[PDB]
Design a protein around this ligand. Structure first.
Ligand SMILES: CC(=O)N[C@H]1[C@H]([C@H](O)[C@H](O)CO)O[C@](O)(C(=O)O)C[C@@H]1O
Length: 412
């Protein structure tokens, strides 16, 4: 079992147990967590570095210099205001004297550095920002993996994909720091913060296959994700967008839902917040899982409506290639016509597909239609279509849920 071989090689694993961050690898590293450091806010094993002063100090146990291969893996999510800074910040520091490793952020890039006793160093750089493209990873969870073969290469993977390699075999002795410090020493502002979760070190060089198993394991494949890669939750406001129309928000026009172009593509939090309600009554704010039944409530001009499927097809009972537009109802309640189900889809994720099984099996997608009974006007229209097997991989069927998140602040 690869996954057992993987886990057996862990020599540090920071995980939250009884509300403390501790090493659960079996090796008993000392973990000193700053009083103000927030733990377990999004993911069980996460921590927030939200300030200078916020620090976590790890002191590794007795098992001078690097003697063996190794890998380091964690997820990271870096706020917009931190990503947009042109400065450089050390985030994780494990250099003593002048040798060891460190992870830095600089101008929208993450950078891993390995430095020998003469201060010769090699770096791995990844531009996670892509100039703040709502297409990049600004404020989105992504999975980092560094692997080291001391008689070979140091490699940087992102979400299981190799991004850069550098020979390290030609460095002189790299002394190994028994201390690892998480935290930003620089003088950061209020909106500059980042989160890390599932930080692990392995005593071997993980293979790309091994890396993909860790990635798939820690992404939580049965948990639906919001736009940032956080778990999607009930009773939480989201701006829901279609993958094909990312600068359009959902809105009712004459009680037909359509997609309206953002007046300003740079502002994410635009439109009518939709709250997801559990059919089965779960604890408030509980995570939404793959396959859950859900009900969608829109806040529109300060009143709550339930989103429901149209009773009749769009060019109108129907069996063959039916297309239904959507609408709003002010009566909240468990109505089959307003029950949907939500499923994960997998490289490009953090998006979801939505289905309804009321009377006919449909999938929600967006395209151009004439959704008004008394008009031939076109509109980008979210619709529930039958016979959707050939559309199961169409981006028109992918939906994202943008939550107001602390790592992405928009002027008031
Ligand atoms: C004017 C308007 O909004 N008409 C809508 C009607 C009325 O909501 C319904 O007849 C009850 O009055 O329902 C639909 O036909 C439907 O659900 O199939 C869609 C149509 O867009």
């Amino acid at each position: 079992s690869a996954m057992a071989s993987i886990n057996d090689s862990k020599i540090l694993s920071l995980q939250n147990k009884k509300n403390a961050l501790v090493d659960t690898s079996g090796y008993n590293a000392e973990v000193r967590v700053g009083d103000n450091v927030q733990l377990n806010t999004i993911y069980t094993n996460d921590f927030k570095l939200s300030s200078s002063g916020d620090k976590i100090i790890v002191n590794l146990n007795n098992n001078s210099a690097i003697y063996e291969n190794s890998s380091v893996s964690f997820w990271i999510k870096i706020s917009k205001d931190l990503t947009n800074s042109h400065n450089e910040y050390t985030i994780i520091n494990s250099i003593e004297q002048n040798s060891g490793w460190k992870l830095c952020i600089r101008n929208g890039n993450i950078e891993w550095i390995l430095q020998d006793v003469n201060r010769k160093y090699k770096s791995l750089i990844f531009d996670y920002s892509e100039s703040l493209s709502h297409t990049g990873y600004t404020n989105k969870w992504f999975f980092v993996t560094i692997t080291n073969n001391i008689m070979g290469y140091m490699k940087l993977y992102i979400n299981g994909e190799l991004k850069q390699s550098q020979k390290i075999e030609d460095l002189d002795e790299v002394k190994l720091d028994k201390t690892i410090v998480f935290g930003i020493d620089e003088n950061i502002d209020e909106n500059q913060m980042l989160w890390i979760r599932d930080f692990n070190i392995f005593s071997k060089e993980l293979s790309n296959e091994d890396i993909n198993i860790v990635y798939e394991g820690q992404i939580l494949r049965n948990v639906i994700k919001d736009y940032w890669g956080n778990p999607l939750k009930f009773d939480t406001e989201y701006y829901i967008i279609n993958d094909n129309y990312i600068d359009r928000y959902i809105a009712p026009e004459s009680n037909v839902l359509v997609l309206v172009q953002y007046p300003d593509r740079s502002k994410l939090y635009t439109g009518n917040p939709i709250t997801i309600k559990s059919v089965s009554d779960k604890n408030p704010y509980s995570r939404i899982l793959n396959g859950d039944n859900i009900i969608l409530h829109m806040l529109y001009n300060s009143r709550k409506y339930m989103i429901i499927r149209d009773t009749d097809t769009i060019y109108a009972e129907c069996s063959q290639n039916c297309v239904y537009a959507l609408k709003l109802q002010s009566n909240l309640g468990n109505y089959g016509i307003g029950i949907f189900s939500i499923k994960n889809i997998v490289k490009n994720k953090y998006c979801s597909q939505i289905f309804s099984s009321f009377r006919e099996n449909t999938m929600l997608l967006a395209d151009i239609y004439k959704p008004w009974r008394f008009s031939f006007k076109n509109a980008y229209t979210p619709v529930a279509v039958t016979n959707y097997e050939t559309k199961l991989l169409s981006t028109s069927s992918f939906w994202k849920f943008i939550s107001r998140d602390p790592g992405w602040v928009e002027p008031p």
